[PDB]
Amino acid sequence: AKSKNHTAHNQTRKAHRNGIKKPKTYKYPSLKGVDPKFRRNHKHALHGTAKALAAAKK
Amino acid sequence: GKSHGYRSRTRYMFQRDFRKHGAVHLSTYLKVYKVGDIVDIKANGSIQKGMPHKFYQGKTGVVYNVTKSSVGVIINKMVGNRYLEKRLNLRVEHIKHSKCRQEFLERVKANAAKRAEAKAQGVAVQLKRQPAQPRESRIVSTEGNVPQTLAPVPYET
Amino acid sequence: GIDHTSKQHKRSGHRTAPKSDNVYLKLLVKLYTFLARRTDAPFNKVVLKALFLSKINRPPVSVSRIARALKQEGAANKTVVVVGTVTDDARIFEFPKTTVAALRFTAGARAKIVKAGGECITLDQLAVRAPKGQNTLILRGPRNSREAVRHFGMGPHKGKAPRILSTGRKFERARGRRRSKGFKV
Amino acid sequence: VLKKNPLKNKQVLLRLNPYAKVFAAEKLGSKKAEKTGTKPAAVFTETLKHD
Amino acid sequence: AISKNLPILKNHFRKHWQERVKVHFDQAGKKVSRRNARATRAAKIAPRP
Amino acid sequence: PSRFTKTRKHRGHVSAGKGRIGKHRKHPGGRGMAGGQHHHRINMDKYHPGYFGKVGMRYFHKQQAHFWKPVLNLDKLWTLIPEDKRDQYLKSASKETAPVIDTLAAGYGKILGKGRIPNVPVIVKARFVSKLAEEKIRAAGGVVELIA
Amino acid sequence: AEQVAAERAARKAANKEKRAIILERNAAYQKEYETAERNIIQAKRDAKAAGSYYVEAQHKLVFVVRIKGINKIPPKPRKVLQLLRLTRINSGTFVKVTKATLELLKLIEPYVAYGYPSYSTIRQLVYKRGFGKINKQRVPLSDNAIIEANLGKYGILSIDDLIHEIITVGPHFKQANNFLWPFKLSNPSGGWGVPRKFKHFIQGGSFGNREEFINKLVKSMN
RNA sequence: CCCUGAAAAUGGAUGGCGCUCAAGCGUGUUACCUAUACUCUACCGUCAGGGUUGAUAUGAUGCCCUGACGAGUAGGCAGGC
RNA sequence: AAUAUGUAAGAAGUCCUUGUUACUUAAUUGAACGUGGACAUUUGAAUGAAGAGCUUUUAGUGGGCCAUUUUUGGUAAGCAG
RNA sequence: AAUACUGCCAGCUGGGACUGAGGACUGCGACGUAAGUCAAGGAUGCUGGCAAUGGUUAUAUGCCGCCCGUCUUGAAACACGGACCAAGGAGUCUAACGUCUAUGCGAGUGUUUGGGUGUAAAACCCAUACGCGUAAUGAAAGUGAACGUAGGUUGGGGCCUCGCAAGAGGUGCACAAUCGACCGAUCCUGAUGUCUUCGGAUGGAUUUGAGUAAGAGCAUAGCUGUUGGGACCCGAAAGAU
RNA sequence: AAUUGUUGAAAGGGAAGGGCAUUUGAUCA
């Protein structure tokens, strides 16, 4: 008893009936996957600038 | 059986353009690569280390990572019914600068200059771009251009 | 036939009055919809909307949260109001004088606030005191702090607290969580 | 409660446009244009009948 | 058999427990019987506690 | 229950709300947890990971008596004393007299470090203590005690 | 409580002022129309008499009427047809002409008919079947008060200004069209005049470009 | 255009009757009939946007205004006998 | 080639000045995050939007077919793909 | 010059069919110098006949209409079951649960294991223990969450101030991501001291958790769904005593 | 109720049965 193997009919309609939107862009992107040294110095730079801002403006 | 590999059905994809064989010209390597810049992808078959997949060919994305010799590009993929980002790394070869970002930059620079020199006076700045409006009225004079009759050519064997 | 671009006779997706048959809550809801209809301040509308939330959509607010909110400058002379419940926190020993309005008040929290010098009033007292909501401040409890919010979103490479009745060893710690026994998540 | 169609009901059309009275009085719908006579050039006449 | 995200449960109900299930429907009756037995013993034990 | 169930509302419908293409036959996927590595492996892998395999030791005769070790963070440390004396001892700070806290009587055998007690002397008596907790009590002026 | 007489007098004075403004604006507009038509006619006559040819500019208006139903429609043309507020069989909408809109209609073209109308047809259609969209409500246009209260930002206060903006595309065309709800209207009185509707005007059918022939049709169509 | 080419089994199909400057064939122009198709109006229900504690007067889950829509197996939810 | 397909067409932007870093440069030379300041009509191509985004639950479904175009096997098939 | 054709009239008029919804006024307008009138946000006036119209059913007339339920892409089929009527008849219950909703209490919550009492299997009251949560991470020994206003930045409803409004400044709960801080495991470097091998202070990680970062949980009830039970009802060819 | 006998009415050129609307007969406020 043979049967259907593959069919692309109605897949486009099935998926497209629910609205497909662009991925919600984030003003602060995920930083995962970058070179480790960039993180190791970025954290120090952020700490330094935060402490400088705290000392300057309270 | 079945064949769906990393380089399946790419006989003409990873093929060097005619009269462009040999080593890669030494100008794409010295381009300064940053983060947040709009850029596209075009694979090169000269080096067999770090090629983009068949889908990623001809796709444009934003750079997020920089390394010794590699870039990180965000590419949206269509599977199912959802847009999802994908982080991918290629060598400095198969990554070509896109002129759309440069066009946007020069347009915004010109717009800022025009806005400044207009607000200096404030008269019909017309900052927005206009599409191809229909042509206005025109006058055609038949001086030396008298129309001549056109007749269909009879069928010729 | 008409080419419709969306669902037909679809509900707004927002609740209209609690399913609860509390006649006191019904009367208070009626008073607040009168306030929203016959005034212009957004206070009445936001109170109307937050009145509709269920028991899990109205998480309790501790007295510690109220004290922390009162620490901000310019908010000391503000009528703190929260929709839901007020619960005493044993981790706070000092409480500044204030005036808190809520649906129902815990006995311990009420005792603490009256000992600190504050007073407790209901929603109608707040409405009759500040119909337009003058010098007020509204809190909402932590909705994503429940025991079930961590449970949703289950899947691989996400780690969202699967559903196991009991916690202990050999309990969803075998193959599927460790690389040494195959793959990890 | 009921939509009244203009151009068939005088009052609704007059209310919608106050120019109804002046348009009717001056009969602007039938205006006689200036009698100007311009003769086309001989080139236009020749090319009209050019075969 | 296997379904969506529900916790794993092991219900040990597979033997012939239809004839073994016992229900304490006589809670109040047993309470009053114990009280009556205590009272009868108290009337019987003499002033001994 | 019987009035509020939708089986009554399902009366008249041929399949009683269970599908016409596939009838409600017996258990088609097996009885209980039939299959965990062949056809139900997807649900065992992406929803219930960690079910198959040995993880650790073999502890014979596990008695839940030697393992009694609760947590008493310092934040909920003043709840042990009665309400009538809590305020009067909060106002009265002195080292000549100290308040004895017997957390063992409360049922907690270990003091854990969190809560930031104000600067008042306090005496506690616990089976076990933590380093940061020890420093936190001793910072105000008190000191923990070890009993068995 | 005697202020009712004073407020009535104030309302009457405001009305009278608004009607006078509308009347003078309509006089100016009709002067513009007559001057423009006389000028274009005289320009054509001068070009003819001077041994030259006058090139008429592409019309700055187009009227689109759907003739195709909602069944057996591909996704892309279905949605772009609905994108111009064409969601009803035998419905009309106003579009301004530009390369984007020209290609928009060209993709739509299989399923609709279009043409360039005159002033009288727009006037009659808006007077007869004028319906608007205020807070997503289908409020019929029977008084100028609602349009003058809702369109005071853009300077439109009477339907005559709306008609002038419709015929003469200007800075206030997009939201003017957004106000105008798509018109639902009955089948043609005299019929389509062609046995096979699904034929191009070059093939001899109602469907297709109508140029100025759309005026007579829409006169019978409405 | 028509014809020979062109022969299958119960008795039959441009539906048949019939039709020959056709009621056959190609094209052109008006008139005529209709679908649960389109416009307007009346009613029902759903949805959405609103008004109505200044009352004796109750059902504000009550009353009223406006507009849009109304097909459907398996199945889901709600209101009722 | 056509068709189809990706990106961008702005306030999450542009520009001026200068604070941090254990990265880096011969080097205040670069990079990221910043502080202060300037640019709201026309906020940066057209159209539209019974509003958009997000979370939980689960019924039924996992045997298809036909129609235009492209096209495989087969001479062909109301054949299979 | 007229005429044909096209388009316009906020030009007039004749004839016919359907509709009468709303129910003291509120508004936009016209006529009228002015009273007042009107075709101006839905029909009134007069007159005639009777005290038959109309509802149900049978027949007749013109048109249409294949036999109910299931399997199936495809049913009315030359596929399946049905001669008829009357009575019975098919997702119920328990244990542990998931989401949601309602109630009560609340960092606590749950009387009914039991005791006292009782108008007596009804109802009322009650002490200690006990289940769940308030701390998690490691196989285990073990350890165990504030450098800060319980951190920095963004979008943020609301609130406060200025501003006629619009808008501008401040605070911004909940939520969304990101950078940071602390806790457990792992890899590390190793401070005083010392039962010379014990002790693990301080500083890190492209590592890792079902963590903390002003608690939210417990008890009951209700729809739906899953597991085990005979499990929506009925049906095997078999096996054992 | 299935089935059947009588009385009264109605219909009947190889089915009956139903819907759209009405005449006719009977009945009905």
Q: Which residues contact B100 (CB under 8 A, 6 or more apart)?
A: B38, B60
Verify if strand H has an atom below 7 Å from the CB of G137. Answer: yes
| E2 in contact with F, Cβ within 8 Å | yes
Closest alpha carbon to G14 in G215, G155, G157, G124: G157
Verify if strand H has an atom below 7 Å from the CB of G88. Answer: yes
- Nearest nucleotide, CA B109 to C1': I14
Sign of CA dihedral B116, B117, B120, B125: negative
Q: How many CB atoms lie within 10 A of CB G195?
A: 8
* G190 exposure class (CB count in 10 Å sphere: 0-12, 13-18, 19+): exposed
Fill in the amino acid letter for G118.
S
Sign of CA dihedral F54, F57, F62, F68: negative
Contact G147, G153 (CB under 8 A): no
Sign of CA dihedral G42, G48, G50, G52: positive
Neighbours of chain D (3+ CB pairs under 8 A): B, G
Hunting for tokens 């347009």 — which residue is that? Answer: B107
What does the alpha-carbon distance between residue F129 and residue F145 come to, in Å, rounded to a whole number?
9
Q: Are G and C neighbours with ≥3 CB pairs closer than 8 A?
A: yes
Closest alpha carbon to F71 in F36, F19, F107, F28: F107
Sign of CA dihedral A9, A11, A12, A18: positive
* DSSP H helices in chain F: 41-46, 83-91, 103-106, 131-140
Which one of G73, G78, G88 has the shortest CB-CB distance to C2? G88
Neighbours of chain E (3+ CB pairs under 8 A): C, F
Contact F129, F110 (CB under 8 A): yes
Hunting for tokens 């290609």 — which residue is that? Answer: G103
Closest alpha carbon to G114 in G45, G146, G66: G66
Can you say how many angstroms the Cα of residue G173 is from the centroid of all Cα atoms in its chain? Answer: 11
| Cβ-defined contact of B134 to G54 (cutoff 8 Å) | no
Which one of F47, F55, F75 has the shortest CB-CB distance to C154? F47
Fill in the amino acid letter for C23.
V
What does the alpha-carbon distance between residue F123 and residue F97 come to, in Å, rounded to a whole number?
10
CA distances C93 to C73, C87, C97, G19, G90, Å, are 21, 14, 13, 72, 74
What does the alpha-carbon distance between residue C135 and residue C75 come to, in Å, rounded to a whole number?
8
Verify if strand H has an atom below 7 Å from the CB of G185. Answer: yes
Q: Which residues contact C128 (CB under 8 A, 6 or more apart)?
A: none
Structure tokens at C165: 């009745």
What does the alpha-carbon distance between residue G106 and residue G200 come to, in Å, rounded to a whole number?
13
Determine the straight-line distance between the first and last CA of chain F, rounded to whole angstroms. 56
Contact B153, G73 (CB under 8 A): no
Q: What residues 9-48 of chain D have any CB closer than 8 A to a CB of chain G?
A: 12-13, 15-19, 22, 28, 31, 33, 36, 38-44
Structure tokens at A3: 């049967």
Hunting for tokens 């009227």 — which residue is that? Answer: G63
| E21 in contact with F, Cβ within 8 Å | no
Q: How was this structure determined?
A: cryo-EM
Verify if strand J has an atom below 7 Å from the CB of F17. Answer: yes
Closest alpha carbon to C62 in C150, C148, C145: C145
What resolution in Å is listed for this PDB structure? 3.9
| Cβ-defined contact of F50 to C156 (cutoff 8 Å) | no
* F94 exposure class (CB count in 10 Å sphere: 0-12, 13-18, 19+): exposed
Fill in the amino acid letter for G22.
I
Which one of E2, E4, E5 has the shortest CB-CB distance to F29? E2
Q: Considering all CA atoms of chain C, what is the largest pairwise distance in Å, rounded to the nearest integer?
A: 70
Helix and strand numbers, DSSP H then E, in chain C: 5, 7
Interface of B with A (CB under 8 A): 64-67, 72, 76, 80-85, 87
Q: Which residues contact B82 (CB under 8 A, 6 or more apart)?
A: A20
Q: Which residues contact B81 (CB under 8 A, 6 or more apart)?
A: A15, A16, A18, A20
Measuring alpha carbon to C1', the residue closest to nucleotide I13 is B108
Neighbours of chain B (3+ CB pairs under 8 A): A, D, G
Contact C174, F52 (CB under 8 A): yes
Q: Which residues are G91's β-sheet partners?
A: G184
Q: How many CA atoms lie within 13 A of G162 on its CB side?
A: 27
What does the alpha-carbon distance between residue B63 and residue B101 come to, in Å, rounded to a whole number?
13
Closest alpha carbon to C113 in C125, C96, C136, C126: C96
- CA C11 to C1' J121 (Å) is 51
| Cβ-defined contact of C1 to G69 (cutoff 8 Å) | yes
Q: What residues 43-102 of chain B have any CB closer than 8 A to a CB of chain D?
A: none
Q: Which residues of A10-48 are buried (b: 16+ CB within 10 A; e: fewer)?
A: eeeeeeeeeeeeeeeeeeeeeeeebeeeeeeeeeeeeee
CA distances C44 to C38, C40, C66, F60, G127, Å, are 10, 8, 21, 64, 43
Helix axes G119-129, G214-221, angle to 10 degrees: 20
| Cβ-defined contact of B83 to A21 (cutoff 8 Å) | yes
Q: Which residues are G66's β-sheet partners?
A: G112
CA distances C150 to A54, C60, C161, C163, C166, Å, are 35, 18, 6, 10, 16
What does the alpha-carbon distance between residue E17 and residue E8 come to, in Å, rounded to a whole number?
23
| Cβ-defined contact of C163 to E6 (cutoff 8 Å) | yes
Q: Which residues contact C60 (CB under 8 A, 6 or more apart)?
A: C84, C85, C86, C87, C141
| Cβ-defined contact of F49 to C155 (cutoff 8 Å) | no
Return left, alpha or beta for G159; rule: phi > 0 is left, psi -120 to 50 is alpha, else beta: alpha
Contact C54, C17 (CB under 8 A): no
Please tell me whether residue G215 adopts helix, strand or coil conformation: helix
Closest alpha carbon to C63 in C135, C116, C129: C116
What does the alpha-carbon distance between residue C83 and residue C49 come to, in Å, rounded to a whole number?
10
Q: Which residue of chain C has the CA closest to E8?
A: C164
| Cβ-defined contact of C164 to E6 (cutoff 8 Å) | no
Contact B98, B38 (CB under 8 A): yes
Closest alpha carbon to F31 in E5, C162, E14: E14
What does the alpha-carbon distance between residue B45 and residue B17 come to, in Å, rounded to a whole number?
10
Fill in the amino acid letter for G70.
I
| Cβ-defined contact of C163 to E9 (cutoff 8 Å) | no
CA distances G196 to G16, G69, G92, G191, Å, are 54, 15, 21, 12
Query: Long-range contacts of range C5-13, CB-CB < 8 Å, 24 or more positions apart?
Result: C5/G82, C5/G87
Which residues of chain E does C163 touch, with a Cβ-Cβ cutoff of 8 Å? Answer: 5-8
Contact B118, B105 (CB under 8 A): no
Phi (first) and psi of residue F108, to 5 degrees: -110, 130
Q: Which of residues 71-100 of F touch strand J (CB under 7 A)?
A: 71, 73, 75-76, 79
Helix axes G119-129, G159-167, angle to 10 degrees: 140
Which one of F31, F48, F51 has the shortest CB-CB distance to E1? F31
Contact G175, G96 (CB under 8 A): no
What does the alpha-carbon distance between residue C131 and residue C121 come to, in Å, rounded to a whole number?
14
Fill in the amino acid letter for B145.
N
- Nearest nucleotide, CA C14 to C1': H48
| Cβ-defined contact of G54 to B137 (cutoff 8 Å) | yes
What does the alpha-carbon distance between residue G77 and residue G106 come to, in Å, rounded to a whole number?
10
